Structures are given as structure tokens and as C-alpha cells.
Amino acid sequence: KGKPHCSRNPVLVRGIGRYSRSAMYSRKALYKRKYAALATVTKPVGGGTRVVKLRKMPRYYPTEDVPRKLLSHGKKPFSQHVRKLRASITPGTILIILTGRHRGKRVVFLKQLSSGLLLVTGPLSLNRVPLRRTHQKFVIATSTKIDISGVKIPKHLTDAYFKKKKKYEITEQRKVDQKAVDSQILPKIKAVPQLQGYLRSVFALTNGVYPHKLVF
């Protein structure tokens, strides 16, 4: 019984500790810390009493059953995976949607969600784009940034909030949260000249335009 301290040695290289084990031995102060040395339930019956057994034997057995598989170690479920993010993708930058039905639309990035999808939201007045999730791979990351450091994103909206439930009609909670976030962003994009016209425009490739040659 007692409070736990964090890992005393900082991580230097992944899989490698900064302090050696004998230096860890002195840092741990282990020199002065030597140490030496369910299923049956009785129930009354209205006779006598009966002793029932929980988890009774199954009444069915298949003709043949699979053998069990060997044990792996490096395989984790999707909820426990690490979620990467590009260095160009920062809160306040402007992204371009490529695969969704909002093709060529310049949409403002808010924050990184839990599952790895990006919460990206241009103003509904300009881009006609709601609070919408977007995968980070299908995103053109333009080097145009606004300062959303001082906005207040609602904590109640998350990946489960944008999860598809089961004809889609817009709920009134979606409309309230739409103007709750846009009211903080829209004055800030008006501080940059010609930024609202930039967001209302659509992205396209013309003749003589090559994405590898140009920078953005």
C-alpha cells in the first residue's frame, strides 16, 4: 500500500532505457530494500433444499469443431492502436477534401479525433460543409493556417456523436453545435483578407498545372 511513482528512467530510444540496471538499482534504492520469504449454490425448495450448479453442461455438441489458434503478441484491436498525424496537419490549417461528396472544397481543420479521423469544418455559410469527419489520408494539406487556439470546441461531440445511427434528417442538436463553433471561427477568418472568398472557391486542376511541380 502506497503511492506509485512514474518510471524513474526516461525513455531514450524505443525499447532502450536511459539508465543501466545497476544504475537503476541505485536509483531504485533496492540496496536497502531486501525482501525475503463458486459454482455450487444451495437453495431452498418449497421437498427440502437443493444444491444447484452454475454453468451447467451444454445440451448440444457439433459434429466437428475447429482447433484453437496459436498465440500472437503484436496484434491489438483497433481501439488500442496508436493514431498518427501529419506534421503539416495542425489545428487551424486549411484542408482540401478529395474523395467525399465535397470534392475540391477548402475545409478548415479543427482537431484530431480518437479513432484517427480528422474533425474538419469549414463554415456552413461559405463551404456548405457541416461538422464532418474526414480521414487524414484523403486530404490535401494546404499551408494556410488560422489561429484557433482561442476557440472552445464542445466536449460532448466526439466520434460516437458523428457515428451513423441506423433517410437522414438534421437533428436540432447538430444545428446548435454548427453555429456554436462557426461563431468562433467566422470572425477569425474575416481578419485575414480574401480568406472567405478562398474558402468559397473550389479546387481544381487546369491545363499546365502539376501537383508535383507546385507547392502549397
Binding site: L12, V13, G15, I16, G17, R18, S20
Partner: protein
Amino acid sequence: VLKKNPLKNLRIMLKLNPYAKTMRRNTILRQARNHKLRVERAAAALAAKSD
């Protein structure tokens, strides 16, 4: 057994050679210390050029 490369897989190298941990515990503190002295030499170089 799948022959994992000891040169890429760090733990297979540690299974074959336990001293490789301190081979790679050093050449990280040493290289950072040597990189620190290179920067401080350049930091002191700006004082020598300006004075």
C-alpha cells in the same frame, strides 16, 4: 521459426547478444554529448566573431 533480422529487430539481437543493449545505450548519450559540444562550439563561435 521465422528468422527475424537481428540488425532490424532489436530484441532478436538482444536475445543473441545481451551486451548489444549497452552497445546502443552508449552511442546515444555519447553522440548527443558530442552534438552538444558541437553546438556550444558554434555558440561560442558567434561570440568570437562578434568580438
